[PDB]
Symmetry: C3
Subunit: 267 residues, 3 copies
């Protein structure tokens, strides 16, 4: 195994190409850049531009009308010496007139790409989730766009898609050492998270990553439904320090009644 | 909307005065000073004085006899280069002879004021909790008195009452920026917490607050019972990033088996 | 009460000696060194030596083959500018050929000593766990060996056994102040954790401890099963700030679906 973060074309994967290379990437690294998945730089511009014009020029009242009453960063605007804009499949809060269109299309592209790669991850590992593949992937995504440092953690998602604007702050553990993860023109960076490890019975690594110290980021978490069900003994076999009585459990059983998106190894 | 933290008299509120002003305060700010609620400065003195005489002059054995065996800061004394004294409605640990009297009366005054303002918050928003108003308010309060810095968080209470001794360290987000919250002679500072937002279907803001860097504080958390029940879809509509299967849930379902009093927006 | 961290011989305890001294130690301090429990310095050498030879000379591929796909520090190797090696009663990941033998024997010695002292703690306090003593002690231990700072916390274990290599970084609160806890040639340091307090109805202190700033440590957590059941009102009486409806609950109910090993007093 070398220490190169690989790149895969989603379309080539969907055509059955690079099977061994993909499978070993998932087992040994758990991250990769993904091309050919409908996330062209053009589009990040349309979405980026109008959010960035809301962030700098939205009035305090305009911001307040798209702020939730609890500051959870789940939907709408959050002031944080940074600003965030969050979305999912429903219950969104949109500025204006043309923002909704642009951002619904952007979200859709990312949700589709995310489901698609996750579908390939399942296929590559021979995994049939309890309840089937499509009910598993029809889930609880969350998109956060941040505009202007992260201690090492791993994601609790199935997969996480990250688009950025281009010093390389983002690094990940590859082969036992942190490696730069720079902006890739027509690629998105995919991190496998803990739910990939869980659902596939340990066939996918969930790598640790952080942001080092010396701008904008789009992070799409593909998160399972509360009712995603898994084998308890199987979870223990792959490193999950579960406190679950009995033989099956749900995501809700494991993580509790509020989504938790990341975890540190520390305790 | 201006950036002034308002003041309301509880008695005027109870008489039906300032309805619009109160309702908009709750929706747009979620904090206010409260007068005319039975929390006169005199009384904080009686209680403050004798706890402060326990903190400086209680022996190590006297302190130990009012320390719980797990250092949870729920009841009795905690050494923390600060000291804390905690109370609720039962299972208390009291020094001496006259402390119990003074502190039971002080606690009662604060629990009554807390229930009263919460009653007004419910009324102002047209909210009938599942199970009714009075069973909701007959809850699980916790009073902590601290004697001698806080990163931004919001409270998970229904309301939080804060009395202090008088540089202004306490600040809260109002209108998108942090604002000083100084000692007010015959007033208590009320923060709405996340359970206010939850129970009222999003009609009350739970503002973020912190303690900035350059003394004593009394913080009364009005916390719901474990069995407080709410609509899951409704929770999602107001920003709660819940992982709850099905249509209703309890506080225990949401937060788990141990009270959590505060939360950071971060994850 | 003096501020000396006591030492007890397990064999003397098992013979009925030092009953008062032991019981008061548990109530007032909740920590002690333990001799005569089968944890001779020789043995820590055998185990220490071969893990330390894996840590410095195991290749990246050899390390990877004993690394779990989620970096939870539950089993096998973790890189962390430190390395960890973790074990329990099953699902272990072992280097080589002779490591498994050595480390299985080492783990067994520590699990036996841990159950033995816990048995004495129960006996000294007259405690019969729900379901009986031996089903309680046939539990979910976790051993972590760390090779090269800790903010104050208390353990959520029944007991924690700590062997170290010999400035004294480890300190604990005894009598209201932090006290050095140096390496003891043929002794192990025992901290009672919160489950000792819980199961005994408050008869055992769970002391706070930390690592101060100016090497290797072996920390064995004896952790209850998910189904360990306790009285809710009784828990509240001893300081546990539980949010549990009804009269009995399990460890899983209280802490959730993932083990949590430590807690800070802070919230
Ligand atoms: C958890 C994260 C949001 S942090 C990392 C990256 N974020 C940034 O690089 C922006 C940032 C700047 C300063 C501090 C934190 C994050 C980004 O996006 N990443 C997410 C992830 O790690 O899955
Ligand atoms: C969570 C808090 C206990 S912190 C804040 C204030 N506390 C203080 O101002 C005293 C303090 C000094 C230094 C560090 C933390 C708190 C106080 O009381 N506040 C509580 C709240 O925010 O609801
Ligand atoms: C939680 C701990 C793992 S930390 C403490 C001691 N660990 C060390 O002394 C090594 C260390 C060095 C630097 C930072 C943290 C821990 C050790 O072992 N202790 C454990 C405990 O406290 O029950
Ligand atoms: Fe992440
Ligand atoms: Fe607070
Ligand atoms: Fe510890």
């Amino acid at each position: 195994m070398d220490t190169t973060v690989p790149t895969f074309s989603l379309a080539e994967l969907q055509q059955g190409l690079h099977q061994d290379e993909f499978r070993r990437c998932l087992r040994d690294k758990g991250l990769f850049y993904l091309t050919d998945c409908g996330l062209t730089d053009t589009e990040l511009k349309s979405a980026k531009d109008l959010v960035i014009d809301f962030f700098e020029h939205g009035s305090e009242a305009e911001k307040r009308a798209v702020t939730s009453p609890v500051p959870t960063m789940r939907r709408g605007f959050t002031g944080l010496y940074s600003m965030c804009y969050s979305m999912g499949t429903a219950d969104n809060l949109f500025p204006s007139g043309d923002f909704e269109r642009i951002w619904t299309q952007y979200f859709d592209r990312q949700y589709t790409a995310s489901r698609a790669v996750a579908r390939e991850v399942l296929r590559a590992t021979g995994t049939e989730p309890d309840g089937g593949v499509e009910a598993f992937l029809d889930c609880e995504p969350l998109l956060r766009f941040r505009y202007f440092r992260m201690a090492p953690h791993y994601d609790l998602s199935m997969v996480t898609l990250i688009q950025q604007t281009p010093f390389v702050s983002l690094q990940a553990e590859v082969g036992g050492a942190f490696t730069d993860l720079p902006y890739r023109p027509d690629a998105v960076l995919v991190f496998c998270g803990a739910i990939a490890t869980l659902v596939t019975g340990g066939q996918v690594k969930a790598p640790r990553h952080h942001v080092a110290a010396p701008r904008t980021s789009s992070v799409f978490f593909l998160r399972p439904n509360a009712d995603f069900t898994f084998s308890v003994p199987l979870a223990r076999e792959c490193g999950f320090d579960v406190s679950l009585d009995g033989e099956t459990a749900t995501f809700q059983d494991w993580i509790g009644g509020n989504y938790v998106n990341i975890r540190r190894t520390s305790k």
